[PDB]
Every structure is written in structure tokens, then in C-alpha cells.
Design a protein around this ligand. Sequence first.
Ligand SMILES: COc1ccc(C(=O)n2c(C)c(Cc3cccc(O[C@@H](C)C(=O)O)c3)c3cc(OC(F)(F)F)ccc32)cc1
Ligand SMILES: COc1ccc(C(=O)n2c(C)c(Cc3cccc(O[C@@H](C)C(=O)O)c3)c3cc(OC(F)(F)F)ccc32)cc1
Ligand SMILES: *c1ccc([N+](=O)[O-])cc1C(=O)Nc1ccccc1
Ligand SMILES: *c1ccc([N+](=O)[O-])cc1C(=O)Nc1ccccc1
Lengths: 257, 250
Amino acid sequence: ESADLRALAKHLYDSYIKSFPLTKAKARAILTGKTTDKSPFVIYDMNSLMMGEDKIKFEVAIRIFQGCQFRSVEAVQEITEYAKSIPGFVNLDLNDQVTLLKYGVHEIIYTMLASLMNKDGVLISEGQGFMTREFLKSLRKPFGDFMEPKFEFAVKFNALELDDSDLAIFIAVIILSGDRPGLLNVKPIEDIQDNLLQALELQLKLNHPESSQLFAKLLQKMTDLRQIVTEHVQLLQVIKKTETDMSLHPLLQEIYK
Amino acid sequence: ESADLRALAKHLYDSYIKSFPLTKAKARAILTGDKSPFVIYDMNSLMMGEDKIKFKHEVAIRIFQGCQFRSVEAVQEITEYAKSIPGFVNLDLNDQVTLLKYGVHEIIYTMLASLMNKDGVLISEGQGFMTREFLKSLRKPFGDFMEPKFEFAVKFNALELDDSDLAIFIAVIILSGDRPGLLNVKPIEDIQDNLLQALELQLKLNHPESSQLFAKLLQKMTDLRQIVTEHVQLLQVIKKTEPLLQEIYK
Ligand SMILES: COc1ccc(C(=O)n2c(C)c(Cc3cccc(O[C@@H](C)C(=O)O)c3)c3cc(OC(F)(F)F)ccc32)cc1
Ligand SMILES: COc1ccc(C(=O)n2c(C)c(Cc3cccc(O[C@@H](C)C(=O)O)c3)c3cc(OC(F)(F)F)ccc32)cc1
Ligand SMILES: *c1ccc([N+](=O)[O-])cc1C(=O)Nc1ccccc1
Ligand SMILES: *c1ccc([N+](=O)[O-])cc1C(=O)Nc1ccccc1
């Protein structure tokens, strides 16, 4: 019945606002550059980077790498917080809860990071700054293509023009995957996701009526997601061996078996 | 006026049923009157108890954590129930969070009393009953965690409140306008001065010869907040004992 599926889309959109302070709605306000309320300092080269550290709160390529690292730790927390509010999730076997978070987090991060990107760069520092795609594309040996495949996915994914109320149901679907390695009761995860997909389906049809087969389009973006996850993971084990003086966070480490 | 407060009351009761599966009427039945739950009185019964019971997970650590998982489910039950309170969803979303952040513990200890008698607590959604003694008997850090919760339950249950009393009572807790960092207390206390009006009528209709039960219930709000502070400082102590799992129980 639609009334329950609509109700679920409201509940989900409500914690999503409550759990992620940097929404696509606020990111596109900033990114459109029409609003003078608070336009971002642009970091486009090494020099404006050093100028950036004066009026913006946050070698070079390393401290930026460790930057994403800290914001990833922080996103895992927000995603974790959002997960709890998905009906039925905290009722699952704790081992399955932990397993849905081990795998769903990366895919939600890049999904949410898309909100903060356009073809030319990414809002950094809670939107205070804008860091350029080509400046990120030009950092030292291995760092220069940490972020470029996230740009590619975002350009492709942002083409769907989802707003936050669609992303809310969709990132819930990502969390509730019954096909994650090592799950103990796949079936109750599948029952929740069944319902989330139902909610997402009516939501996509209502929020984007003329945009036909958006659901099918979106579901198929989760191929690009698992791909981007895997490039990042192996591209991370080079840096483990490139720089043994640089340290992965315990929390993110446990999300990388 | 009277019959709106009664409409408000039965709204809350009806909604509290949906949101809280094990109710005090349900609980009280198991504790004294078939469908009796497995009892954990010592170490021996516990190891057999996990074997036969349906639970998601050192012993004192395991019981402590089991209390954290239930806690997190309660937060979801209370959160789902809070959204049914007239006017709640329309408050500033920042204030909804603040009310829930602080009100959540006081609701948990209120509803935990429903599952407690002087001898122990109904556990495992009522499928078990863990004796109060066996929780006393836990290690110095863990053995005084749930004793004050029992102490409160004994006093609170002496009020002999039912689920329809508790429906309105727990709403009142959530719409407390003295929680730190509220941006717009006016509506919060407009809803509370409404919930209290209906709790007044409800108690007087349903406990007509229990004079000043309303006053007595509101003073028990004092004891709720002192238990929250007791429990908080107790976690201070045990934070001196020991990652994704930790991120869930923050
Ligand atoms: C899952 O939800 C979120 C997704 C992204 C963000 C976010 O602010 N990020 C930004 C702007 C970034 C981009 C960025 C670039 C340089 C420094 C950064 O750190 C600080 C200065 C910041 O800008 O937040 C951040 C980001 C990167 C991340 O790691 C990655 F996904 F790439 F593996 C994770 C989150 C990131 C926050 C929550
Ligand atoms: C709507 O509010 C509540 C919802 C559930 C419960 C509940 O079942 N609890 C029980 C039986 C308990 C007692 C208990 C003891 C040992 C193990 C427990 O975990 C399992 C058995 C369970 O989830 O019931 C639970 C409990 C404890 C809690 O944390 C505390 F408040 F004490 F800090 C919170 C909820 C608890 C109590 C109030
Ligand atoms: C973020 C911004 C820039 C770079 N870089 O120039 O290499 C890298 C990252 C990034 O994704 N860092 C990271 C490391 C470990 C775990 C999560 C994120
Ligand atoms: C529940 C049962 C037993 C113990 N113990 O013996 O230490 C503790 C608890 C408990 O309430 N744990 C808890 C921790 C943090 C937040 C809520 C509940």
C-alpha cells in the first residue's frame, strides 16, 4: 500500500537530514555560484592551497590524502548513525549489522560524495572550499588518481539528478544488501530491502514522473559503485607499501578486510 | 476540554501499543500468571540459557553489552513513538533530536520498570527472566549497574500504573522544555502543557482513589533524571576497562 511506502520515504528522509549535515541540497546551493550568501574559496594549484590554509579551516599530496581519511572516518559515523534509524536494522543479528556496515559504508560514501562533486571538482571543508579535479589529478605518483575515478562515477551518477529524498531510500537499500560476504541471516535483510526497494520505486516514480525507468537506471549504478570501491582498496595497499610512516585509521582499517 | 484529552489519551495509548511490542500488561502477566520464561539465577543457568534462548551478540561484559543492544532498539521504539505525539514532527528538527537525545534514557528506565519485579528483570523480549540477585552477583564494576534500576522500579511500580497511564506519561518526558540546547521551547511546552492536562484526567479517571498520583508521578521524574546521571557516571568508571561495533553503541 502506497501510504506505508510513502510513510517510509518520509521517515528515511527525516533521519537522512538529521544524520548528514552536508546534503546535496546545500551542496548544489553552494555549487551553483549564484548565491553570494557564502561562495567557497577555490584551491586550484599549490599556491592557492597555501593561501587556502589562512582563511579556511580544514608535503602536500599526503596531507590531502589524510584529509579524505579523516572525513571518511567522520562519514562512517554519520552513515552508522543513519543505519540505526532504518526500520528493522538494529533488530538484526549484531554480526550482520556489523557486516552490512563493513560493506555498505564505502558505497554510501562515494554515493554521498557525488553530491559534493561536479565535473570540475569537489566541495571540501563542509563546503568552505572547492578543490579542483585537475589539481587533485596532478598530485605525486600514486595520489593523482585517488579521486579521479570518484569524479568519473559522480559525473555519471549525478546525471540521474537525484535529490536528497531519493538518496535517502537508496543509501538505505545499499546498507540492506543480503549478498554481503559472511551474513548469518540473509533473509531478514532481504525482507527489509524488499520494502526499501518498494519505497524507492514509488519515490522515484513520484519525484521524477517524466523520468522513466530511473529506478532501473539507479539500481544499475551500483555496479559502478562496487568498481570504485575496489580500485580505491588496492590503490590504498600501494600507499601502505609506499609509505609505511603513514597510518590508516583503526575504524577504516576494520572496513577494509 | 475533557473529551479531547480523552481523544489525546487514546491516541497515545493506541500509538504506544504499535511502537512497544512487550507492554506492561503483557509483562505483568508473564511475571505472575502457560507461557513462563527460562530463568537465569547463576552462572550455570546462563550458559544453558544462551543455548536455548534467541539472543543477538567474559560473562559480565556480555550481559552489559546485551543491555546496550536492547537500549539501541528502545531508542528506535521511542523515536517511532515520539513521531506520533501530536505536534512533535512539526517541531524544529534540531529540537526533535535534542528532546529524543535526553528523553530517551528516562523513557528506557520507565519502560524497564515494567519488566522488573523485586526479584529480577524480564529479559530477551520476555523469553527469559534474569534474577536480580545474579546481576548483583556480577563483578564490582558490573554488579552495581542494574541495582539502582531495580531500586527505582520497585518504587515506581508501587504506583500501579498501566500502559494507558504510561502512554501519556512517557510523552510528557519527551516534551520536556528544559533539555540543553532547545531553539524553540514555546511549542514544546505547549504540547507538554497539553500532555500533562491529559495525564491529569487519565490518572484521575483511571486511578480515582489514588489521590495526588499526578504529583507522585511528576516527582518520579526527578528520580528518573538522577538515574540517568548515575548511569552516565557509571559508564565513566567502566570506560576504564577496555570499532565498527563501537560506532553503533555511541
Ligand atoms: C558518506 O558521506 C560523506 C561523504 C563525503 C563527505 C566529505 O565531506 N568528503 C569530502 C568533501 C571529500 C573530498 C576531500 C578532499 C580533500 C580533503 C578532504 O578532507 C577535508 C578537508 C574535507 O574537505 O572534508 C576531503 C571526501 C573524501 C572521502 O574519502 C573518499 F571517499 F574519497 F575515500 C570521504 C568524504 C569526503 C562527508 C560525508
Ligand atoms: C521501550 O523501552 C525499553 C525497551 C526495552 C527494554 C528491555 O528489554 N531491556 C531489558 C529487558 C534490560 C535488562 C537486560 C539485562 C540483561 C540483558 C539484556 O538484554 C537482552 C536480554 C534484551 O534485550 O532484553 C537486558 C534493559 C536494559 C537497558 O539498558 C539500561 F537502561 F539498563 F541501561 C535498556 C533496555 C532493556 C527496556 C525498555
Ligand atoms: C582524498 C583526497 C586526496 C587524495 N590523494 O591526493 O591521494 C586521496 C584521498 C583519499 O581517498 N584518502 C583516503 C585514504 C584512506 C581511506 C579513505 C580515504
Ligand atoms: C545491562 C545489564 C547488565 C549490566 N551490567 O551488569 O554491567 C549493564 C547493563 C546496561 O545497562 N548496559 C548499558 C550500557 C550503556 C548504555 C545502556 C546500557
